[PDB]
Amino acid sequence: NVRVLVVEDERDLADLITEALKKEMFTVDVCYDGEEGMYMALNEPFDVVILDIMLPVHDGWEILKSMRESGVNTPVLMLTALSDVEYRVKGLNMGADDYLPKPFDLRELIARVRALIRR
Amino acid sequence: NVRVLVVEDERDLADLITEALKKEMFTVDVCYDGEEGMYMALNEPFDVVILDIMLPVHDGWEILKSMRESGVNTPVLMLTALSDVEYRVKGLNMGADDYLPKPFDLRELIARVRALIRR
Numbered sequence: 253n254v255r256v257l258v259v260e261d262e263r264d265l266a267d268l269i270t271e272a273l274k275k276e277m278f279t280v281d282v283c284y285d286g287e288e289g290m291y292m293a294l295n296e297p298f299d300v301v302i303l304d305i306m307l308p309v310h311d312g313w314e315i316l317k318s319m320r321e322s323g324v325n326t327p328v329l330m331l332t333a334l335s336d337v338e339y340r341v342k343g344l345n346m347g348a349d350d351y352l353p354k355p356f357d358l359r360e361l362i363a364r365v366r367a368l369i370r371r
Numbered sequence: 372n373v374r375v376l377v378v379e380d381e382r383d384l385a386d387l388i389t390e391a392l393k394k395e396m397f398t399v400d401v402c403y404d405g406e407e408g409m410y411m412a413l414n415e416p417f418d419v420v421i422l423d424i425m426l427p428v429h430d431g432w433e434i435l436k437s438m439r440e441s442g443v444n445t446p447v448l449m450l451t452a453l454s455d456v457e458y459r460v461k462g463l464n465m466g467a468d469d470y471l472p473k474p475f476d477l478r479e480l481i482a483r484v485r486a487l488i489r490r
């Protein structure tokens with residue numbers, strides 16, 4: 253009943269995130285690059301999109317804007333090493349629904365993803 | 372026009388936030404205690420509620436809990452000095468949509484506020 257898209261280039265972390273989400277009983281599709289990320293985010297239906305910023309081919313910024321520019325209002329959560337507040341504002345102002353810098357606490361990530369779905 | 376409710380017992384801070392918000396074009400109502408905040412939150416309509424936790428007569432946990440139990444699905448942002456991640460998770464789990472600890476960057480506060488009312 254809940255499909256989550258994960259876009260993160262650090263495979264092991266991406267898998268860590270995915271397993272945690274699946275343990276919440278969510279259907280999770282994971283991408284290790286911004287190319288497939290973009291494709292999945294623009295062609296497949298999701299309830300939440302967890303997005304890394306710095307990615308190959310297309311960065312999290314581009315993926316978010318393309319989604320909004322295409323009418324896809326799916327809730328977006330950015331998870332990235334760009335932690336400076338200025339970046340947080342940039343992501344949010346651009347259309348992200350939440351922004352959680354790395355390193356992150358797994359409990360907070362799940363809590364925030366759940367906050368986005370029920371909403 | 373957008374309605375924002377502010378519940379903070381730190382008058383100076385509360386007023387500071389109230390000013391900044393209206394500057395961003397927001398109809399703000401400020402409360403300095405949990406008594407005025409409890410009423411407004413459970414009886415008056417808002418687009419987003421910014422809830423401090425430690426307050427006289429009624430604490431933020433109480434107000435947030437009373438809201439969700441009464442069917443008030445209004446977006447809620449917790450702005451509190453209870454910064455520990457475990458408090459953040461509890462806040463999100465209880466029904467808050469976002470949780471921002473103190474001290475905070477005023478830019479991140481309105482960025483998050485607008486992102487919340489953006490739905």
Ligand code: BEF
Nearest residue numbers: 304305306332333
């Ligand atoms: F490379 Be991501 F922005 F952490």
Ligand code: BEF
Nearest residue numbers: 423424425451452
């Ligand atoms: F008084 Be609040 F909880 F920062």
Ligand SMILES: [Mg+2]
Nearest residue numbers: 261304306307
């Ligand atoms: Mg990356």
Ligand SMILES: [Mg+2]
Nearest residue numbers: 380423425426
């Ligand atoms: Mg207080």
